Enzyme design. Structure first.
Site, PDB file in Angstrom:
ATOM      1  N   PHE A 162      51.666 -13.305 -48.211  1.00 25.26           N
ATOM      2  CA  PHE A 162      51.896 -14.709 -47.679  1.00 25.26           C
ATOM      3  C   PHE A 162      52.156 -14.681 -46.170  1.00 25.26           C
ATOM      4  CE2 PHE A 162      52.659 -16.085 -52.345  1.00 25.26           C
ATOM      5  CZ  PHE A 162      51.501 -15.873 -52.573  1.00 25.26           C
ATOM      6  N   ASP A 192      45.442 -16.922 -45.624  1.00 28.81           N
ATOM      7  CA  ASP A 192      46.154 -16.830 -46.925  1.00 28.81           C
ATOM      8  C   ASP A 192      46.528 -18.153 -47.488  1.00 28.81           C
ATOM      9  OD1 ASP A 192      48.390 -17.701 -45.823  1.00 28.81           O
ATOM     10  OD2 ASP A 192      49.480 -15.800 -45.649  1.00 28.81           O
ATOM     11  N   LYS A 214      88.480   2.144 -54.900  1.00 32.66           N
ATOM     12  CA  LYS A 214      89.777   1.951 -54.123  1.00 32.66           C
ATOM     13  C   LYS A 214      90.860   2.211 -55.126  1.00 32.66           C
ATOM     14  CE  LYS A 214      88.824  -1.669 -50.513  1.00 32.66           C
ATOM     15  NZ  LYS A 214      89.755  -1.616 -49.643  1.00 32.66           N
ATOM     16  N   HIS A 263      95.447  -3.570 -50.671  1.00 35.54           N
ATOM     17  CA  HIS A 263      94.667  -2.621 -51.722  1.00 35.54           C
ATOM     18  C   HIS A 263      94.263  -1.431 -50.766  1.00 35.54           C
ATOM     19  CE1 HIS A 263      90.867  -4.493 -49.398  1.00 35.54           C
ATOM     20  NE2 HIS A 263      91.597  -5.619 -49.805  1.00 35.54           N
ATOM     21  N   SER A 298      86.030   0.429 -47.946  1.00 35.54           N
ATOM     22  CA  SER A 298      86.326  -0.721 -47.247  1.00 35.54           C
ATOM     23  C   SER A 298      85.425  -1.818 -47.990  1.00 35.54           C
ATOM     24  CB  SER A 298      86.284  -0.260 -45.770  1.00 35.54           C
ATOM     25  OG  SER A 298      86.045  -1.560 -45.175  1.00 35.54           O
ATOM     26  N   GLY A 299      86.165  -3.058 -48.032  1.00 34.22           N
ATOM     27  CA  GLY A 299      85.314  -4.220 -48.352  1.00 34.22           C
ATOM     28  C   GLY A 299      84.427  -4.637 -47.350  1.00 34.22           C
ATOM     29  N   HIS A 300      84.887  -4.825 -45.827  1.00 32.38           N
ATOM     30  CA  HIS A 300      84.063  -4.841 -44.925  1.00 32.38           C
ATOM     31  C   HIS A 300      82.825  -3.962 -44.828  1.00 32.38           C
ATOM     32  CE1 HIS A 300      87.011  -7.538 -43.670  1.00 32.38           C
ATOM     33  NE2 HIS A 300      86.249  -8.168 -42.601  1.00 32.38           N
TER      34      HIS A 300
END
Ligand code: VO4
Ligand code: VO4
Ligand code: VO4
Ligand code: BR
Ligand code: BR
Ligand code: BR
Ligand code: BR
Ligand code: BR
Ligand code: BR
Ligand code: BR
Ligand code: BR
Ligand code: BR
Ligand code: BR
Ligand code: CA
Ligand code: CA
Ligand code: CA
Ligand code: NA
Ligand code: NA
Ligand code: NA
Ligand code: NA
Ligand code: NA
Ligand code: NA
Ligand code: NA
Ligand code: NA
Ligand code: NA
Ligand code: NA
Ligand code: NA
Ligand code: NA
Ligand code: NA
Lengths: 597, 597, 597, 99, 50
Positions: A360, A367, A399, A479, A484-486
């Site tokens: 689409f 379409d 971790k 932690h 790494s969380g980021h």
């Protein structure tokens, strides 16, 4: 009779779809995760004590001695037990913080600062989130990060050297990396790193494939403090998506007519059109030159759970990211998906097309179908945000349940204590002897930096200190370092965005932050940037921002990015069972190859 | 790999389809059916007898005393046991009919008439059909009718009053309801019913929802003796489909030419084109003014299983339905699906379009496909007829296994015996004290009507009788009152027809039966009727026809219509698994809402 | 412990019953269907064209050349593809009709008649209904009809000869088959057929068993134009059930008394008591002597989808079936189950007993149980009608997905074109050389008949034409010849009726239509007819009526009857799982043997 | 023996968790959705035209007359068919916009 | 100006509104919408700052 399929009730079809997705996930199989062996390698140095020392493991929160080694190995072993069980009562039974005053119940800190603030303890952030299941995507435990670098390795020496150089370079402006006024420091950084084996010697045949993939070569001003995702190496340091604004409401093409927003200038001054309101790309300004945990007592208090969160000072106002410290500030408080949601909003406002292999996507005269809920803006806006928690479960497993790698501040603690003792002819933490020897010149600079900070903090005659200066008062989150969380969320989110959009779209105008004023200026960059490239760069920006704050190492970030990519891919694969349409996402992966999902 | 489905053999696909339909039906769940509590509430009035009396339960066929109460409670309890087991031998063991003559073996009746005819007994009609399973649609036991009105209730008082009024009004012509010549009787009926609490007082918050839905308000000539399905209330009493003929063979549009049947006039004289032959809408004429079971002995013989079937007399010929009695005659002998098959044939001959949401309903130049076996005439002709037996199983469960409600004739019997005893200062059947008090004026008229009939029947000086006059010699069928076979089949069949056709189609000409001649005349009605409306009206016509004969109450009919709707809907839902085409039926339900199946 | 079974919930018992029925159906296994090989045998006669010609396949609706062969083989191959897929969009993409006028969009026809009418196209009637599943009975694809006769076979020669003889005999009265006034034509028909190998030579050892079963011998006046079901050969041509009325309301036995309907005479004048109304056995009268598609241009227009439906003329009134044409008219417009519903209603009204092996069929003094919902009138009335759609799905599979046999009109087209060309010394459609040679005398008569019709139609000097005259303006329905909708439904419905009733009951009075007046007269037949025999005869009447109209061949009908029998038997077998009672149906099959179900 | 549960692999526990969630959702049952009846109630006002008008239905995109009623009911009926199938080719076949 | 009546659809009963006032003009009926100012705090206020 003619072979055929049959219908069933909608409800049963829904159930079967969900089971088929679970079956797909199960059929991927699982791989083990291998740790680097340090946890039981390093032993208590006392000749009448055979216990492990746990010096290379994350032990932030458990009571430490004056050298920064935990006092009681049972404290860490119980922590490990609680990690693997997740039982809340068991967690509540752990030892957290130092001894408490029987009269007030307050922790007794080493530092005057902590005691004057009457700080309490902070606790581990979801130490058992690695046990949590999920309704979609690969199970947290089904995938792996490889062993982390060991303290004695050339890799770790290079990593910690780089973190010290970033700390000492926090007041350098990105746009001035190659400026003559910065040449003495910048060349020092380049030469120091180029003096280290990791950077000046290639991997050897038979080295771990993961090492070969992430090992870096010759350091230049053009690659200094950069990541290695494809696209990060081209053009300016900062992704367009973390400095530019977007097209604004009132700018539009209507048939043969072009309308121009009265607010059009806002695009070029860091305002993202956020629906009918705005997001400002301008970041709060942490006090320049002010670092933390440069005093051993304050450092040890932080290691013993002293809750310094919220202690930073700021200048008034906000500015487009200017210095290394500003990127650290950015990643101190961002919602983990924030950068990628913001990039998504810029892409949407600017009219960057979705993947042409979605349904689409043609002009509607062809379409008869426009997109929104599926294959459109609402779809990607939910999908880019939803992957974050699934990626975080996986990184929590790595971790806490697997690797338990000590944070950089902890490595800097070992280095400082080692160097101080060696000057008196004593050997403490011989495990970091190589780092201490190799980083001599850098540590000399750190010592001077730390004395200045210690005096500023009101200690008129501070002990020598070689600690890694922290951008944040509390240092790392509560932690372990790896991953790494980021960076895991960066990996997952930019994977979704590259998949969902036409990531090959070329960007027309390239900007940077001006050298003299708080404004955007045209970049001198002459090549072509792509959406995919600038999304990768954004992920590397957020990830390295943590390193510039002092809280992650290079390998934490790179390996986390790869892990998050796997999570997002698996979600897309399982979700593909749910649609009736004929389509796929085209996804350029971090390794330079493309998968169609 | 690209997600996929697989083929299997045709045979397995057929099997799986059938299982999926069964699974759909199972997944609907089931609901219980609740009876009104009368069965064990009412007790034997003798002070030395604690047994239930069963006076409000269907006991037709079990031996009754001179008051119309069963002689032996074990007779009814064994009947109940046989109902729930269905075992043929057990059924054959029950007590049926009164004591027999040892010399002839014949039942000994109370009435001279029955003894002179040497009548035998008739038995229960499928007392365990509520146990039968079915290959399609909701299981007979999976759905419920709510508790029937109790003898002491305002609802029952209203119901029985209405039935007496219909009985006394049997010679009234539908087309003359509002004629001044009928005003004295018609106004009497309106005023009597408006004097009853059910009609003159609304339902109250907290009443059963089923009562709220079916409770009627102010009676008018415009709603007198009508049902409440949407459409029944607009325009003439009788549905078009029970009086009009259809377009005839030889009338057709062929390209640009219109051909006219030489038999075209037959449409307007009640001839349905039935393939290449015809159905006449003209009904046989039961002797006007002749009613049955107006003598207590004959009544009790009928209660004791005396088989009076076939005893009615008729005038020669046939006529379009003229009187209330004619509608009673119509529903005495109709095949239960007859009215709806006939309506279907009219719709087909007249070229009324099928549901536009079916496939292939466009001009063939567009879709290259005409309809017959599926989505066409043959389809609906099978579907409308096949639902009848499935609906009947469900109503049998309600009739025999659940509610066992006494038929109106039985209620009239209690009323008559009560009133006769009260005139002598005695209390018999105090359960119907309220009906007897409230229906005083109506009962006075019934007494006079009954004496006239009793004299006609050859009793020169008959005892007073307040029985409900029956249109049929045998009174009700040999099964309980609640629900109704006619009404459940009506509900199921008109559901199918509204589903299958474009039920929103507006009818062009509206007819009624002429006031003076046996002919159709143009109606004076000024509004617009629809197919859906006139199908609903047809269902109400057939259902109320049973009430006019004296064999059902209002609530029996309404609740049965709803039950039949549920059966037909479930069949359509399960059948939808069997087609490859993309379509649905649009069905306007009795409650005013639409479901797409 | 004592071996035992256990109860479960009603809902689970219902589910398990349905699954057990599906399992029973699956366990029957399946058989393949084999076509006769003509589809790819016959090739384009042009020496530079190797394509199949498809001349023996149904191609009505696809554009034909002036000889009646399709213009483009891709048109038929796409039709085949669409047949097997059932996709509505794919169906809508097919080529239907001839080229259209760009100004009006209307089809351009060959004939002045079609162009003057401005006819549009008609489309295929459910070309993929053979893919539809069903909740009950054998799956449409699980059973087979054998290969159809080929064009070159003695069987086909006999079949087409018979159809021409019926066409030329349309004005002959059934009651006058053996009348001296008809002797010249009747003896011609008998002698012509007796001159053909199929009729005058027996099957040979090693012939297909299906051929042996259906092959006919010596033609006589007593078997002329009759079917071969057991019973068709005894007594008068027409089944009692298509001419007689029934016992009327008011005729009944009540105890020791016999009451007589004032309308009793109606029984003997073709009035069926239909509930309390009536069905008239009198059929509309198509214009005697008027046939259709006798002109090659009109014929080709019909082959090219010209919608001539509705074009016939009629005389006023109606009469008991008198002529061969009247039987054709009957089956032009009947609902497919109409004849059998009508027979059922006669059986019910006349009091013909149900199968004595059903439960509860004894006098009620013995069994305490009468029948209605199960094992009674309502049961059979639903069951006889419901089987029709299941039988039609199966015949659709054979018609469209398997055999695609050309209709008789198409065979007559090949014969005509062949004969015309041969007279000029050219060979066209040599495939029908044998029919053309063998049918010489018959074709001479057809030529004369056609010229008369062509002149009547307003062509003052018509081309010679040997086409098979059609009773219907549009000729055949828009679907292949083999099998037949009418005949499959006949097979299924009379199977149900023989099963359900006591089919061995002997009929007391035998009637025929009077030779001089529109009334019934006592038959001179001296033997005994049975319900089973007269039900079989009725099925053969309806089936052969299609042949007399010109739209089916003998083998289409016989093989369809057998297929419909299988459908009805399977429905009964699966339904038997649903009842608790101990019983079976006794069913005399078409092959002379009995099965108990 | 003391009643007990058993462990399985992490992977199987994850699979079983997901199935249990699907089972919970299935066990909620389903309910039908009922429309208000307007779609086939309102008819073309022309006396020689019995078609539905669809005036109370969403028809934005289908060609409308000068009064705002759709020109061709087949436009809406095809739209409905495409809605229930989701087939992209079928969607692309619909009538959208004016001439 | 007229309440729902016994026997009305439950969904109508739940969503039917009564007397219009300046205090409810153009408001929704979710619990909380009717108390205090028209606009939610969350669409006009800022937040605590770093
Ligand atoms: O949120 V982090 O694991 O980049 O400390
Ligand atoms: O056929 V009935 O249950 O309306 O007596
Ligand atoms: O309805 V037929 O297949 O006998 O043309
Ligand atoms: Br469902
Ligand atoms: Br985190
Ligand atoms: Br992958
Ligand atoms: Br198969
Ligand atoms: Br019944
Ligand atoms: Br429903
Ligand atoms: Br149950
Ligand atoms: Br057919
Ligand atoms: Br068999
Ligand atoms: Br595992
Ligand atoms: Ca589009
Ligand atoms: Ca069509
Ligand atoms: Ca019996
Ligand atoms: Na030691
Ligand atoms: Na400051
Ligand atoms: Na993409
Ligand atoms: Na500057
Ligand atoms: Na008592
Ligand atoms: Na039709
Ligand atoms: Na409908
Ligand atoms: Na009159
Ligand atoms: Na050739
Ligand atoms: Na004529
Ligand atoms: Na039988
Ligand atoms: Na004659
Ligand atoms: Na109209």
């Amino acid at each position: 009779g003619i072979p055929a399929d049959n219908l069933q009730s909608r409800a049963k079809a829904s159930f079967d779809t969900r089971v088929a997705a679970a079956e797909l996930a199960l059929n991927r199989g699982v791989v083990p995760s291998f740790a680097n062996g340090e946890e039981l390698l390093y032993r208590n140095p006392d000749p009448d004590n055979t216990d492990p020392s746990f010096i290379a493991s994350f032990t932030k929160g458990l009571p430490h001695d004056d050298n920064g080694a935990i006092i009681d190995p049972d404290d860490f072993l119980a922590f490990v037990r609680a990690i693997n069980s997740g039982d809340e009562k068991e967690i509540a039974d752990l030892t957290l913080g130092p001894a408490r005053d029987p009269e007030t119940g307050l922790p007794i800190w080493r530092s005057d600062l902590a005691n004057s603030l009457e700080l309490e303890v902070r606790g581990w952030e979801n130490s058992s989130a690695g046990l949590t299941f999920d309704l979609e995507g690969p199970d947290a435990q089904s995938i792996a990060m490889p062993p982390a670098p060991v303290l004695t390795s050339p890799e770790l020496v290079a990593e910690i050297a780089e973190l010290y150089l970033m700390a000492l370079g926090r007041e350098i402006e990105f746009s001035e990396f190659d400026s003559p006024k910065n040449a003495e420091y910048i060349q020092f950084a380049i030469d120091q790193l180029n003096g280290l084996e990791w950077f000046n010697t290639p991997a050897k045949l038979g080295d771990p494939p993961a090492e070969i993939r992430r090992r870096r070569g010759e350091v230049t001003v053009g690659n200094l403090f950069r990541g290695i995702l494809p696209g990060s190496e081209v053009g300016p340091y900062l992704s367009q998506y973390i400095i530019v604004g977007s097209k604004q409401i009132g700018s539009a093409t209507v048939g043969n007519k072009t309308l121009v927003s009265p607010n059009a200038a806002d695009e070029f001054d860091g305002e993202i059109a956020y629906g009918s309101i705005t997001i400002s790309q301008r970041v709060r300004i942490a006090t320049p030159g002010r670092d933390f945990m440069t005093d051993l007592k304050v450092f040890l208090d932080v290691q013993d759970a002293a809750d310094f969160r919220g202690f930073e000072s700021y200048e008034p106002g906000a500015r487009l990211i200017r210095t290394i410290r500003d990127l650290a500030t950015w990643v101190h408080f961002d919602a983990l998906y924030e950068a990628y949601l913001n990039a998504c909003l810029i892409l949407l406002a600017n009219g960057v097309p979705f993947d042409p292999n979605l349904p689409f996507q043609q002009e509607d005269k062809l379409d008869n179908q426009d997109v929104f809920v599926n294959f459109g803006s609402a779809h990607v806006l939910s999908l880019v945000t939803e992957v974050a928690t699934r990626a975080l479960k996986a990184v929590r497993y790595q971790k806490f349940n697997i690797h338990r790698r000590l944070r950089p501040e902890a490595t800097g603690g070992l280095i400082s204590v080692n160097k101080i003792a060696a000057q008196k002819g004593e050997s403490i933490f011989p495990e970091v002897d190589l780092a201490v020897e190799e980083l001599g010149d850098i540590l000399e600079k750190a010592e001077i930096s730390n004395r200045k900070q210690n005096i500023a903090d009101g200690d008129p005659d501070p002990d020598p200190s070689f600690l890694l200066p922290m951008a944040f008062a509390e240092g790392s989150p509560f932690h372990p370092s790896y991953g790494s969380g980021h960076a895991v969320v960066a990996g997952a989110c930019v994977t979704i965005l590259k998949a969902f959009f036409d990531s090959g779209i070329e960007i027309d105008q390239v900007f940077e932050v001006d050298k003299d004023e708080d404004k955007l200026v045209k970049s001198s960059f002459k090549g072509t940037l792509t959406v995919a490239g600038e999304l990768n760069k954004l992920a590397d920006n957020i990830a390295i921002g943590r390193n510039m704050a002092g809280v992650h190492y290079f390998s934490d970030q790179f390996e986390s990015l790869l892990l998050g990519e796997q999570v997002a891919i698996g979600i897309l694969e399982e979700q593909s069972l749910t649609y009736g349409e004929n389509f796929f996402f085209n996804l350029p992966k971090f390794d330079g190859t493309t998968i169609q999902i």
